[PDB]
Amino acid sequence: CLSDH
Amino acid sequence: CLSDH
Amino acid sequence: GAMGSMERASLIQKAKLAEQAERYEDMAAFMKGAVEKGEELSCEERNLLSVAYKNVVGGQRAAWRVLSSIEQKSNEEKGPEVREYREKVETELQGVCDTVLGLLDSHLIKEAGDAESRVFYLKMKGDYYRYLAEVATGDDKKRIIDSARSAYQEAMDISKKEMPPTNPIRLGLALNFSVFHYEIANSPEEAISLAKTTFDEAMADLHTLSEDSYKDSTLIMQLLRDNLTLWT
Amino acid sequence: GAMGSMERASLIQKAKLAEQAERYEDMAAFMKGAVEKGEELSCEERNLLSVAYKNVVGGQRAAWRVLSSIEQKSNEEKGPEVREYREKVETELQGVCDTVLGLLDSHLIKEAGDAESRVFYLKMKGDYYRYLAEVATGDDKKRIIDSARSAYQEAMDISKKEMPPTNPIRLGLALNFSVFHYEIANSPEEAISLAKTTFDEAMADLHTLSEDSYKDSTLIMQLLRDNLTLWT
Ligand SMILES: [Ca+2]
Ligand SMILES: [Ca+2]
Ligand SMILES: [Mg+2]
Ligand SMILES: [Mg+2]
Ligand code: NA
Ligand code: NA
Ligand code: NA
Ligand code: NA
Known part of the structure; x- marks a missing residue:
């Protein structure tokens, strides 16, 4: 579950 | 120039 | 705070240096000091603020997840140490979030x-x-x-x-x-x-x-x- | 110090937890507390002490090298900020080395x-x-x-x-x-x-x-x- 860089 | 781990 | 005596431009400059050195706690402290000068932030400055705290809290979150997993496996024989240390990291994480939320509330959002x-x-x-x-x-x-x-x-x-x-x-x-x-x-x-x-x-x-x-x-x-x- | 109230065994346990969480500043503070209990360190404990401070000073050295290189390129137009921030990191690095050397001198070496x-x-x-x-x-x-x-x-x-x-x-x-x-x-x-x-x-x-x-x-x-x- 990746969030914004 | 590597030193000990 | 401790950055009150440093020029706004110097704080921004040092935030960029700290980013290059991967010193994100320093970077966040510099950007907090810049925010507390009271002027609105430029696009680049907003991104410096975000990068700094994202990396600081990111390390805390990663540590908290490691300790939380050890703690739950411990509850699936030892004493209070795992819970104590997870609580320590958790409190520090909450402190960083409260700091960021305080900057947003005083007064970045209302001037944006x-x-x-x-x-x-x-x-x-x-x-x-x-x-x-x-x-x-x-x-x-x-x-x-x-x-x-x-x-x-x-x-x-x-x-x-x-x-x-x-x-x-x-x-x-x-x-x-x-x-x-x-x-x-x-x-x-x-x-x-x-x-x-x-x-x-x-x-x-x-x-x-x-x-x-x-x-x-x-x-x-x-x-x-x-x-x-x-x-x- | 701030670890004076914590059990030696609890400090060692938390040092190992901090290592798992890659929280090396915490790890070093725990191991410093363990050393200051005054008892000699086992082989495993000596390695925990070494790992903790190696990682702390390793991050400082890497940061100092980045800032030193920027500073020398700056001297090959700006103001004092690069030198100031390099000096800040340098002083913190020297403080960690002085801490380690102080533990060795008081009194790890003489009891070894x-x-x-x-x-x-x-x-x-x-x-x-x-x-x-x-x-x-x-x-x-x-x-x-x-x-x-x-x-x-x-x-x-x-x-x-x-x-x-x-x-x-x-x-x-x-x-x-x-x-x-x-x-x-x-x-x-x-x-x-x-x-x-x-x-x-x-x-x-x-x-x-x-x-x-x-x-x-x-x-x-x-x-x-x-x-x-x-x-x-
Ligand atoms: Ca603790
Ligand atoms: Ca500085
Ligand atoms: Mg001014
Ligand atoms: Mg005791
Ligand atoms: Na708000
Ligand atoms: Na505005
Ligand atoms: Na000595
Ligand atoms: Na001895």
């Missing part, structure tokens, strides 16, 4: 009139309530989750009225709000719907972009796609 | 009677004077370099009398003393000679080792070989 600044800060407010929610247990967990949702929702409303669907701030907001839905709010269908609609509306707007903006937007779209592949 | 503990601590003393020498400028640079050399030399003398040539402590000492010669003392020929003799004498002793010790020793021998390949 342009869409790009206001959406940026409201997204940050959602993000740091989301990090608080990750470690919250029980009932005030409910109020923290609603504060994150409210901040994200206000940011979304503005971004849909004021920004094109490919705007990287708008895309990153939608990405993080979709993670909020999936990981925090127990709404995976809302997470998937938001990520898909965001991706599709950005795709239909790519034709308007320069090569450089195209690169910026498609990088975040790939993150949406990666999550959808994980979630479906 | 066995070869494995005494060589370990004297090697550490050489290492942290070496880190001080990396940032020292001028004349007290000379005295810092001699303190590193003296500590390494005493460690070497003991290790050659009391340890087999494959002993990992002995090998790591010789590795780091050879780096001291090459990087600090401007004696590359001494560095190469030491690394080669150390490698060759360990090679002739490998036949005595179990499979597990063989693995431990050859891993450090590879580090000697890597340096010799870089240096010749």
Whole structure:
């Protein structure tokens, strides 16, 4: 579950 | 120039 | 605070140096000092603030997850040490989130009139309530989750009225709000719907972009796609 | 200090947790607290102490090198900020080295009677004077370099009398003393000679080792070989 860089 | 781990 | 005697421009300069040195705690302290000078932040300065605290709290979150997993395996024989140390890291994490939220409340958000600044800060407010929610247990967990949702929702409303669907701030907001839905709010269908609609509306707007903006937007779209592949 | 109220065993337990969480500043503070309990350290505890401070000062050294390079490029138009921030990191690095050296002097070394503990601590003393020498400028640079050399030399003398040539402590000492010669003392020929003799004498002793010790020793021998390949 990746969030914004 | 590597030193000990 | 301890940065009160340093020039605003010197604080920004040192934040950039600290970023190059991967000294993110220093970077965050410098950017906190810059914010407390009371002037609004430029686009570049907002990104320095975000990068610094994202890296600081990112390390704390990673540590908290390691300790939390050890603690639950410990409860599946030892004494209080794992719980004590998890609590220590958790309290430090909560302190960093409270610091960021305090900067946003005093007074970045209320002075942010342009869409790009206001959406940026409201997204940050959602993000740091989301990090608080990750470690919250029980009932005030409910109020923290609603504060994150409210901040994200206000940011979304503005971004849909004021920004094109490919705007990287708008895309990153939608990405993080979709993670909020999936990981925090127990709404995976809302997470998937938001990520898909965001991706599709950005795709239909790519034709308007320069090569450089195209690169910026498609990088975040790939993150949406990666999550959808994980979630479906 | 701030760890005075915590049990020695709890400090060791939390140091291991902090290592798992990659929280090396915490790890070092816990191990400092354990040392200040006044009891000698076991082999495992000595390694926890070394790992913690190695990672803390390692981050500082990496940051100092980034800032030092920016500073020299700046002197090949701006104001004092790069120098100020390099000085800040440098002072913090020196503080960590002084802390480690203070633990060794009060009173780890004087209570260390066995070869494995005494060589370990004297090697550490050489290492942290070496880190001080990396940032020292001028004349007290000379005295810092001699303190590193003296500590390494005493460690070497003991290790050659009391340890087999494959002993990992002995090998790591010789590795780091050879780096001291090459990087600090401007004696590359001494560095190469030491690394080669150390490698060759360990090679002739490998036949005595179990499979597990063989693995431990050859891993450090590879580090000697890597340096010799870089240096010749
Ligand atoms: Ca603790
Ligand atoms: Ca400074
Ligand atoms: Mg001023
Ligand atoms: Mg006791
Ligand atoms: Na606010
Ligand atoms: Na304004
Ligand atoms: Na000493
Ligand atoms: Na003793």
